[PDB]
Amino acid sequence: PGATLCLGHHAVPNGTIVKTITNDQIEVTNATELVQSSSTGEICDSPHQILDGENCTLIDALLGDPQCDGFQNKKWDLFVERSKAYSNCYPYDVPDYASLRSLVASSGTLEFNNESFNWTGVTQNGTSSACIRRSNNSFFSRLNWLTHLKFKYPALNVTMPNNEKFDKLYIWGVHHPGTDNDQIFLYAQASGRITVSTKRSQQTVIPNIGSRPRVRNIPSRISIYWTIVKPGDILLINSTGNLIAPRGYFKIRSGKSSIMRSDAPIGKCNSECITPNGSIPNDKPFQNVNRITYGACPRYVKQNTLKLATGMRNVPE
Amino acid sequence: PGATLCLGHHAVPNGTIVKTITNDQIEVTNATELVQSSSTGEICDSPHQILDGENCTLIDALLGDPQCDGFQNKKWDLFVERSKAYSNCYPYDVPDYASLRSLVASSGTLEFNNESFNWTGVTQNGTSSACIRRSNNSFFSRLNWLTHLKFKYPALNVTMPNNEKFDKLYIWGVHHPGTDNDQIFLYAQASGRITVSTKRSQQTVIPNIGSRPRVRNIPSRISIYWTIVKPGDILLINSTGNLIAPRGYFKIRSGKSSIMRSDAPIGKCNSECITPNGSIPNDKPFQNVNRITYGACPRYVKQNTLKLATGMRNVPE
Amino acid sequence: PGATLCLGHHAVPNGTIVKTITNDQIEVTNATELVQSSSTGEICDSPHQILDGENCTLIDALLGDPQCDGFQNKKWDLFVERSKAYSNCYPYDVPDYASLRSLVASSGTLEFNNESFNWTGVTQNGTSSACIRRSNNSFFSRLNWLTHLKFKYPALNVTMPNNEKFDKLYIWGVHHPGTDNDQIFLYAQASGRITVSTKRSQQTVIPNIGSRPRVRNIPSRISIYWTIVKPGDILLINSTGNLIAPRGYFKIRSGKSSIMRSDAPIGKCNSECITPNGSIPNDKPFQNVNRITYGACPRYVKQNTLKLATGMRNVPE
Amino acid sequence: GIFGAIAGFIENGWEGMVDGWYGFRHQNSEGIGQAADLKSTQAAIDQINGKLNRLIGKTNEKFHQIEKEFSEVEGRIQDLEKYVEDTKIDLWSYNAELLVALENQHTIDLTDSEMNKLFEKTKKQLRENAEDMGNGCFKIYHKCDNACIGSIRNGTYDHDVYRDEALNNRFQI
Amino acid sequence: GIFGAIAGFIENGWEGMVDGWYGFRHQNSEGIGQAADLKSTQAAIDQINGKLNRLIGKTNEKFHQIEKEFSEVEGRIQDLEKYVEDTKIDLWSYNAELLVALENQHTIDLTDSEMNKLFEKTKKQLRENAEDMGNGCFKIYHKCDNACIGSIRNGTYDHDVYRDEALNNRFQI
Amino acid sequence: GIFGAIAGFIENGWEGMVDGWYGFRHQNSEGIGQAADLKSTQAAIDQINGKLNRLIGKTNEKFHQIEKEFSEVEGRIQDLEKYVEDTKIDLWSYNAELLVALENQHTIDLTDSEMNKLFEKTKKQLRENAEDMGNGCFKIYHKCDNACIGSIRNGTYDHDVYRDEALNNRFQI
Numbered sequence A, B, C: 001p002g003a004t005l006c007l008g009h010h011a012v013p014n015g016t017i018v019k020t021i022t023n024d025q026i027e028v029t030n031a032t033e034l035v036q037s038s039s040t041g042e043i044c045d046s047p048h049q050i051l052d053g054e055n056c057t058l059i060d061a062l063l064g065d066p067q068c069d070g071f072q073n074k075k076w077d078l079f080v081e082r083s084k085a086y087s088n089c090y091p092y093d094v095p096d097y098a099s100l101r102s103l104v105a106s107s108g109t110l111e112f113n114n115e116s117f118n119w120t121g122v123t124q125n126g127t128s129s130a131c132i133r134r135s136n137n138s139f140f141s142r143l144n145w146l147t148h149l150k151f152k153y154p155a156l157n158v159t160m161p162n163n164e165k166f167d168k169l170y171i172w173g174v175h176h177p178g179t180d181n182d183q184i185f186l187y188a189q190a191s192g193r194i195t196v197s198t199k200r201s202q203q204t205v206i207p208n209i210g211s212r213p214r215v216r217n218i219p220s221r222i223s224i225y226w227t228i229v230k231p232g233d234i235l236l237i238n239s240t241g242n243l244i245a246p247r248g249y250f251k252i253r254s255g256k257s258s259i260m261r262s263d264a265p266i267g268k269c270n271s272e273c274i275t276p277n278g279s280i281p282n283d284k285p286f287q288n289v290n291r292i293t294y295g296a297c298p299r300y301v302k303q304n305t306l307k308l309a310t311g312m313r314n315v316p317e
Numbered sequence D, E, F: 001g002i003f004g005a006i007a008g009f010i011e012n013g014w015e016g017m018v019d020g021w022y023g024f025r026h027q028n029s030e031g032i033g034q035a036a037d038l039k040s041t042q043a044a045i046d047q048i049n050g051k052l053n054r055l056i057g058k059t060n061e062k063f064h065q066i067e068k069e070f071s072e073v074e075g076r077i078q079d080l081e082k083y084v085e086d087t088k089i090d091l092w093s094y095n096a097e098l099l100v101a102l103e104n105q106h107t108i109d110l111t112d113s114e115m116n117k118l119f120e121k122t123k124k125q126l127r128e129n130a131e132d133m134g135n136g137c138f139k140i141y142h143k144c145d146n147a148c149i150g151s152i153r154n155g156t157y158d159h160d161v162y163r164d165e166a167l168n169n170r171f172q173i
């Protein structure tokens, strides 16, 4: 009689299809998903310091638009800009807006030390009806609108040395008045010229009087510029009018910080990876949620699923 | 006596050499080429809408150089620029020529709606002997050369609102006269200043009188600029002379369109992939014909051949 | 009795750990390192023509700062800039410094032909106490500081045609005086305007009088610009003052040349691959020494070791 | 599939083997039984976990990068920003597609190998006391009760004990 | 080569087998013959076509990109445009070189595997009626006419029918 | 490991075999000996050198590139320069990690294959004159002096010479 001894392997009733080198569809006993394709919809507030911009662009908070006063001296790992945000101070533009945005975002701080600039000969703290702070007329909190003292605007030549261990980032601007009358009213001469300089750099700007289409009923404009002053170097503002001067400087750091456009609500939760659609788990090596990511994230790929076999070929009865 | 039963495999007299992980030269029974390395020499006119530039750069057709009048309002998947092409109107330059070229190319249309600009106070439709249209003196078809009316050039302040659902692309320019005399002759004052503006942007340009080396015997120059005006925004041209004004706007779309430099003839044929050397088949996954491609194309690699084995190792008798 | 015949394989007492697809730690009999992770510390002077900048940036040698006179007409495969280097002539800046640096570096030559420019009406060869050459006051060797002749500076309009087979690269500049007095002293009129032009291009520059913080006790500045003039084209300098004119042109080539920042000493040795830390051997396919390389180099990767098994699995007794 | 066991000479898997990946079925005088082989099962599982270790939970930190969506037409610099990101994504997508396809081919083959190794080890153990039926089963030419079958599964089977009995049954007319 | 059949224990291929990739040659009482095995042949061919499906006709559409040739020196922005494209091309070139070399190693090995599997299946079928000569051939120890050889090629050979005859011829002095 | 020989049915390697990678140990009437097999050894070594040829000394020349370190904050264009290089380095780092892991898996498997092939070739050679003990060793059922063992190592062993003697010893009670 004897006996029979058979060698075999298992199989399952619920197989999954995977791709191989030789065959785009072969059934295996089990598999695991390698592409993360969903989010909860929320930006988790840990473990990164999230700063919700709310109504303010980063730039508006930098300048000191009055609805952004809560943002003074704050820090962030990720600054989140909302699409509903809007400016509500003096209408402005920034040549190379994206570069200023990027470098502030990347520095990750709005820390501002004031400095005593020698503005003898002019009227400081100019205000306007387009930049309201508690029903009064006001201005950009970190800028200083200089006008004439007794219908006289003497030639300015103000120095500010960097004797510190770190870089100073100076934000300043140029008023472009709406009419020739306004140019005389505010500065008591025909359009000036500004020249901000250091030992390594110089930026000269020409004010240009004229009407632009009204933004919040204001046809004048301010053009914002910036200057980085290194240790042992000196800031030098030369002007004969139209200067929107700095009240001080921003510290500029390096670090992990950045900025992201998103409309996701901020949650009380912990998640290393952030996208504009919400935080995503980072167990998987790939994701197709968003090409824009921050933190320890799976790498973005075009595929929406990639099945890795974690079992043998399934061969049913 | 019994019998003999031998197991074997085939072989061929004409083997091919392939590369492997362990050996750069092993003979297999058969192989297929994975690098496409040839073209017929022709750009196939299907399935992409090809527009042969012939004598005209895209920019010349945009502006309305007189040999490019056939190109008015045309569309393209791929615009093809020829190396023999040349300009034959008023000598010009474009700061950031490449960016204007790119964005028009990518929009894929030259569709132009005219608009009734309020040019009361000046003489429109200025002409020149360097821009010939049917033996008469003429100008760029889409631009408007404004000169004095009765030796007077009043200050211009013309508005054009975008009340449409789409962006408008405005092309305009600044005349730089050859001499001080010509500046008075054409505009009745010393060199002006132009200021084209919107709610989000402003471009001011200074005309600069002086001689440049003659191009087609003309030492003056026009500098071309552009402006995109969004829905609910308004164009505003401020000027005291030297304005080469727009007659209207170009629609700007997004899509599949682009531009390619090539001297290949256009064929009556069907081919998904286009290079500057001609169309190429796209059966293979790689090609070494050109790094510049358009359509569904094999990916460019440095190798000129890559043999994939499609048979077993060849082991002759 | 019979016999016993055993089949086996070798093993070693000193195994090495390698990574595999299925196991991050498996012992093999032998392995070879694929990441080059060290240098001797020296830049080998062969087989590439190394030019040690020493005290001079490439730009200083281009302009002709007086400590850089040894560099006139020299060639290089790799120009090496030292961090100790400093300028000691007239304080200057270059808008787009990086682009001029890059294109000279890449051309790989400083070959300079002088040209006889028609400067009748002015005083050539202006000097200064901030640019010392053998205790005398001097200037940038390749530039020409034009001042008034008999308190008169006539309008300049000087032509220089490129009748050659190759491009000419012209380097020129604009003096920005410290005070209004100095502007009259040197040029006998109020601030001029320069306009360098060709058939395809024009660069107009506005001088801007004013004080900048002193660099080597000098508050004035020169701003350096450049112009490439093609075969059959013509250079044209228009000016009413403030021109720092060229004495001639640089040949511009294409080739293998470049530039590297390093403080490594130059050795008498042969090595195809150069990094800022010194030359490295190129037997291995990868390196983690520096992402900046020149020559036939291993590719930079983040890993500091990668062990390739060159033997079987080690299975000790 | 490259070894020829799973989806080859083993006609199909066993859905009723739920305690291991590989195993033994027998018929003898005491009935018909089944048991898992732990060592084979663990060998395949360890190797698959080795792959998973390299792929699960090994992500990389990025912080400030470049802009990848744009509200305005700009031309040159934006073309280059878009192109770089599109380039990056295609190469990573290629890497992910190739990884999965190679790993999957290799997982299918290593699982087949583990089956083949268990069959070969068992065949050697049985020496001249059994013949291979060609479908993963051995005809054992001697009385082999549950303790005997047990001794084969456990690697303790002494083939000399049954050799006389088996040779005789094997080479009979 | 990794299984040891093609370019191993099978000394060479047969140029005169033009109707399949793998097959049988025999010598018996009725003469000397040849026949292809379709199943082995198709198994290898299907797998190679599987690779071809992934590589042939699977290209990607690109439209507006960046400029990759330049008529003027420009410096910074052009360096970066050139660098990005040079970077892209080297990584794709690397991908293509590695793909071909891995696929080729694997094709050579799968074809060798298919040969080894056909040899192993045949060896089991013959049970104790034949011995392996070490060069891909079996010495069959019984009269085996064309229908018998046919039955081995077709998987219908009944080994019990010839077992007596074969054992006797095998273990004779 | 995929063939089951090295770190499988061969329990361990031999540290005292220093003249080859693979080899033979014997016990017979004249004593206990060892010898390397050159052909197996060379087959594995050639294949590993084939890999080394593709990896050692095959570097690529680059000259002027882009700047990769910066002394000033600049914003947009520098972000894009940094990003491109960071992108390039991660993809090359990925390529190097994957290469080493695949090549290593394959080297371990080809070395195991070479061992298995030498065992299989030897098993066939011995025909009915020996049985496999399951640990890489054959019990040879006849007097086999040093010249006989030599003839097996050299591929010249004539199995018909000892067949009578071996069959008798094999199937005795």
Ligand SMILES: *[C@@H]1O[C@H](CO)[C@@H](O[C@@H]2O[C@H](CO)[C@@H](O[C@@H]3O[C@H](CO[C@H]4O[C@H](CO)[C@@H](O)[C@H](O)[C@@H]4O)[C@@H](O)[C@H](O[C@H]4O[C@H](CO)[C@@H](O)[C@H](O)[C@@H]4O)[C@@H]3O)[C@H](O)[C@H]2NC(C)=O)[C@H](O)[C@H]1NC(C)=O
Residues within 6 Å of the ligand: A030, A031, A032, A283, A310, D052, D056, D057
């Ligand atoms: C099909 O194939 C897959 C992959 O091979 C198998 O899934 C794995 O199964 C194991 C065991 O069931 C799981 O191990 C558990 O991991 C938990 C962590 O899960 C979270 O975090 C990981 C990433 O770190 C994510 O992958 C995952 O999605 C979750 O978000 C642990 O918390 C578990 O711990 C429990 O058991 C241990 C015992 O040691 C205790 O100490 C704990 O207290 C706790 O009770 C556990 O270790 C593993 O997560 C699964 N991996 C994946 C990728 O999904 C399937 O099992 C298999 N299917 C079948 C039918 O075989």
Ligand SMILES: *[C@@H]1O[C@H](CO)[C@@H](O[C@@H]2O[C@H](CO)[C@@H](O[C@@H]3O[C@H](CO[C@H]4O[C@H](CO)[C@@H](O)[C@H](O)[C@@H]4O)[C@@H](O)[C@H](O[C@H]4O[C@H](CO)[C@@H](O)[C@H](O)[C@@H]4O)[C@@H]3O)[C@H](O)[C@H]2NC(C)=O)[C@H](O)[C@H]1NC(C)=O
Residues within 6 Å of the ligand: B030, B031, B032, B283, B310, E052, E056, E057
């Ligand atoms: C060596 O190895 C290669 C690859 O394995 C083999 O070449 C293949 O062979 C098959 C059969 O001969 C070919 O199949 C045919 O494809 C035609 C399409 O060809 C064009 O388009 C493809 C891409 O879509 C390109 O690859 C190709 O270059 C051509 O531009 C079909 O039109 C054919 O159809 C014919 O037969 C069918 C029968 O089903 C009918 O329905 C049709 O009416 C028609 O008569 C056919 O399907 C295949 O193209 C080849 N591939 C490649 C990549 O070249 C060799 O056969 C092999 N050599 C040897 C000696 O074995």
Ligand SMILES: *[C@@H]1O[C@H](CO)[C@@H](O[C@@H]2O[C@H](CO)[C@@H](O[C@@H]3O[C@H](CO[C@H]4O[C@H](CO)[C@@H](O)[C@H](O)[C@@H]4O)[C@@H](O)[C@H](O[C@H]4O[C@H](CO)[C@@H](O)[C@H](O)[C@@H]4O)[C@@H]3O)[C@H](O)[C@H]2NC(C)=O)[C@H](O)[C@H]1NC(C)=O
Residues within 6 Å of the ligand: C030, C031, C032, C283, C310, F052, F056, F057
């Ligand atoms: C562990 O694994 C590694 C790799 O498999 C083995 O190392 C190799 O061993 C061989 C032989 O010992 C070496 O071959 C020799 O190469 C020399 C060149 O070396 C330099 O250049 C190469 C790149 O071109 C670099 O890889 C290397 O680091 C050196 O900078 C030759 O000069 C040698 O020539 C000598 O012998 C020949 C005989 O033909 C004579 O003609 C010459 O006159 C001269 O005497 C020789 O060819 C090889 O370099 C090693 N490769 C690597 C990558 O290191 C180990 O052998 C192995 N270990 C063990 C214990 O087995």
Ligand SMILES: *[C@@H]1O[C@H](CO)[C@@H](O[C@@H]2O[C@H](CO)[C@@H](O[C@@H]3O[C@H](CO)[C@@H](O)[C@H](O)[C@@H]3O)[C@H](O)[C@H]2NC(C)=O)[C@H](O)[C@H]1NC(C)=O
Residues within 6 Å of the ligand: A210, A211, A212, A213, A214, A219, B157, B158, B159, B234
């Ligand atoms: C150049 O032309 C533009 C466009 O006409 C001039 O701007 C326009 O100026 C008027 C007022 O001077 C604005 O009228 C407004 O009407 C609303 C009614 O709802 C009223 O609430 C406001 O108080 C205001 O009076 C008009 O909107 C405005 N348009 C734009 C687009 O700015 C411009 O003033 C002219 N330039 C010069 C230098 O005069």
Ligand SMILES: *[C@@H]1O[C@H](CO)[C@@H](O[C@@H]2O[C@H](CO)[C@@H](O[C@@H]3O[C@H](CO)[C@@H](O)[C@H](O)[C@@H]3O)[C@H](O)[C@H]2NC(C)=O)[C@H](O)[C@H]1NC(C)=O
Residues within 6 Å of the ligand: B210, B211, B212, B213, B214, B219, C157, C158, C159, C234
């Ligand atoms: C600055 O100098 C340049 C170069 O000398 C002046 O341009 C030159 O002007 C003359 C005419 O005024 C051009 O002469 C031409 O000669 C041809 C003969 O073939 C004739 O057909 C033309 O009608 C013309 O008279 C000369 O080519 C031209 N050269 C260049 C390079 O433009 C320029 O006018 C001077 N600037 C000022 C403001 O005067």
Ligand SMILES: *[C@@H]1O[C@H](CO)[C@@H](O[C@@H]2O[C@H](CO)[C@@H](O[C@@H]3O[C@H](CO)[C@@H](O)[C@H](O)[C@@H]3O)[C@H](O)[C@H]2NC(C)=O)[C@H](O)[C@H]1NC(C)=O
Residues within 6 Å of the ligand: A157, A158, A159, A234, C210, C211, C212, C213, C214, C219
């Ligand atoms: C705008 O204000 C700046 C800063 O006060 C003025 O520059 C300064 O000018 C004085 C001389 O006029 C420099 O004094 C120096 O003192 C040293 C003593 O060690 C002496 O060796 C020098 O000969 C020199 O007299 C001072 O350093 C300098 N500071 C800077 C930062 O440049 C500038 O002149 C004013 N602008 C105008 C148009 O006056």
Ligand SMILES: *[C@@H]1O[C@H](CO)[C@@H](O[C@@H]2O[C@H](CO)[C@@H](O)[C@H](O)[C@H]2NC(C)=O)[C@H](O)[C@H]1NC(C)=O
Residues within 6 Å of the ligand: A037, A038, A039, A276, A277, A288, A289, A290, D069
């Ligand atoms: C994450 O958010 C992005 C938003 O950018 C989604 O991608 C867009 O989806 C819309 C509509 O589904 C498409 O028309 C666009 O083509 C996408 N935009 C871009 C810029 O690619 C994405 O679908 C979201 N993903 C998840 C998982 O929620």
Ligand SMILES: *[C@@H]1O[C@H](CO)[C@@H](O[C@@H]2O[C@H](CO)[C@@H](O)[C@H](O)[C@H]2NC(C)=O)[C@H](O)[C@H]1NC(C)=O
Residues within 6 Å of the ligand: B037, B038, B039, B276, B277, B288, B289, B290, E069
């Ligand atoms: C396709 O056209 C291009 C034209 O750019 C050819 O590439 C050039 O070939 C010339 C001469 O053979 C070389 O000197 C250049 O180095 C190449 N230029 C560039 C920019 O790479 C290419 O040979 C053509 N290919 C085919 C298959 O026709």
Ligand SMILES: *[C@@H]1O[C@H](CO)[C@@H](O[C@@H]2O[C@H](CO)[C@@H](O)[C@H](O)[C@H]2NC(C)=O)[C@H](O)[C@H]1NC(C)=O
Residues within 6 Å of the ligand: C037, C038, C039, C276, C277, C288, C289, C290, F069
């Ligand atoms: C080669 O030189 C570079 C100098 O850039 C070294 O990399 C820097 O090392 C310092 C200190 O070890 C770190 O703080 C920096 O993060 C590195 N700088 C950059 C820009 O990455 C590198 O260590 C040197 N390598 C060798 C092998 O000598």
Ligand SMILES: *[C@@H]1O[C@H](CO)[C@@H](O)[C@H](O)[C@H]1NC(C)=O
Residues within 6 Å of the ligand: A014, A015, A016, A029, A030, A031
């Ligand atoms: C099969 O069914 C079980 C039990 O319901 C489930 O947990 C498992 O994940 C399923 N496996 C697959 C591969 O679908």
Ligand SMILES: *[C@@H]1O[C@H](CO)[C@@H](O)[C@H](O)[C@H]1NC(C)=O
Residues within 6 Å of the ligand: A054, A055, A067
């Ligand atoms: C943000 O602005 C909206 C109106 O634009 C207002 O409803 C909301 O209360 C504001 N919130 C804050 C915190 O300013």
Ligand SMILES: *[C@@H]1O[C@H](CO)[C@@H](O)[C@H](O)[C@H]1NC(C)=O
Residues within 6 Å of the ligand: A154, A155, A156, A157, A193, A194, A195, A238, A239, A240, C209, C210, C211
């Ligand atoms: C700079 O300031 C000085 C001193 O007040 C003055 O003489 C000069 O005119 C100013 N220049 C400009 C351009 O504002």
Ligand SMILES: *[C@@H]1O[C@H](CO)[C@@H](O)[C@H](O)[C@H]1NC(C)=O
Residues within 6 Å of the ligand: B014, B015, B016, B029, B030, B031
């Ligand atoms: C070999 O010859 C045939 C018949 O002429 C041909 O069609 C086939 O493509 C050739 N194969 C190779 C691999 O060269």
Ligand SMILES: *[C@@H]1O[C@H](CO)[C@@H](O)[C@H](O)[C@H]1NC(C)=O
Residues within 6 Å of the ligand: B054, B055, B067
């Ligand atoms: C293009 O211009 C050339 C001369 O430059 C001329 O021969 C040809 O006829 C022109 N064709 C068209 C369509 O303008």
Ligand SMILES: *[C@@H]1O[C@H](CO)[C@@H](O)[C@H](O)[C@H]1NC(C)=O
Residues within 6 Å of the ligand: A209, A210, A211, B154, B155, B156, B157, B193, B194, B195, B238, B239, B240
């Ligand atoms: C703009 O137009 C207005 C109204 O005609 C005029 O007062 C002003 O001078 C113009 N400005 C410029 C710069 O052209």
Ligand SMILES: *[C@@H]1O[C@H](CO)[C@@H](O)[C@H](O)[C@H]1NC(C)=O
Residues within 6 Å of the ligand: C014, C015, C016, C029, C030, C031
């Ligand atoms: C082992 O030892 C030898 C002899 O000292 C040495 O040359 C060899 O490189 C070592 N091998 C490994 C893998 O460590």
